[PDB]
């Protein structure tokens, strides 16, 4: 029976969580996807020759950290930490999201990938060397993406599936 991986896309408002997920699922760039809508999506993929089913949660909509919600997020097997390269606050919010995840999972090894989205933009305020360095300190992979041009979208998600597989090993 084909393996199921539950992936959670996290990051500040407007970083591109919805546009990344819609590119992976529908291969189309949405620029007006309702910001409050928190939906999940299923996609059958072949990664390194093994077929699997991804269940992908695109987080949305401001809410306080509750206990019920903690238990819902505990079911995530892997987390995409998304910042935008032209949003210093989005980059700064990464540590906060990683700790919340370390907390609910009650564990130091959680499968995670750092994603710097909007790499198509010319106005970059977060240097590639800064994000590499952070990812090295977490010991997680770092991918630069553009949901707009589709550069790196599949690779960010499939890098996370590979982190989950190694974890399960
Ligand atoms: C347009 C607005 C938008 O896209 N965003 C993203 C940001 N929202 C959040 O950061 C957010 C959401 Cl969504 N829910 C919550 C708090 N709820 C919650 N309770 N327990 C947990 C546990 C975890 Cl691990 C999370 C993660 C997965 C880290 C988001 C969330 C909760 N927050 C802060 C506004
Ligand atoms: N230029 C560029 N714009 C993007 C990219 N990704 C998303 N956007 C735009 O940024 C805004 C927020 O995207 P969205 O996916 O809704 O962000 P979310 O709140 O994290 O879901 C929208 O206008 C998108 O069209 C990208 O990779 N490059
Ligand atoms: Mg969204």
Author numbering: 0 to 168
Publication passage describing the model:
KRAS is a G-protein that functions as a molecular switch regulating cellular proliferation in growth factor signaling pathways. Mutations in KRAS impair the cycling of KRAS between its GTP-bound active state and GDP-bound inactive state, leading to dysregulated cellular growth and oncogenesis. The switch-II pocket is a shallow pocket between the effector protein-engaging switch-II loop of KRAS (residues A59–Y64), the α2-helix (S65–T74), and the α3-helix (N86–K104). Upon ligand binding, this pocket undergoes significant conformational rearrangement [e.g., increasing in size from 150 to 280 Å3 in the case of sotorasib (3)].
We describe the construction of a cross-docking database comprising 100 examples generated from 10 structurally diverse KRASG12C inhibitors with known X-ray crystal structures (3 of which are newly solved for this data set) and describe a method of incorporating receptor flexibility into CovDock to produce a docking protocol we refer to as FlexCovDock. To further benchmark the performance of FlexCovDock, we collected ten co-crystal structures of structurally diverse ligands demonstrating conformationally diverse switch-II pocket poses. We then docked each ligand into every receptor structure, leading to a set of 100 docking simulations (10 self-docking and 90 cross-docking). As shown, superposition of the ten receptor structures from the cross-docking data set reveals dramatically differing backbone and side chain conformations for the switch-II loop residues (Ala59–Tyr64). The adjacent α2-helix (Ser65–Thr74) likewise demonstrates significant conformational shifts across this set of X-ray structures. This conformational flexibility results in markedly different ligand–receptor interactions in differing X-ray structures.
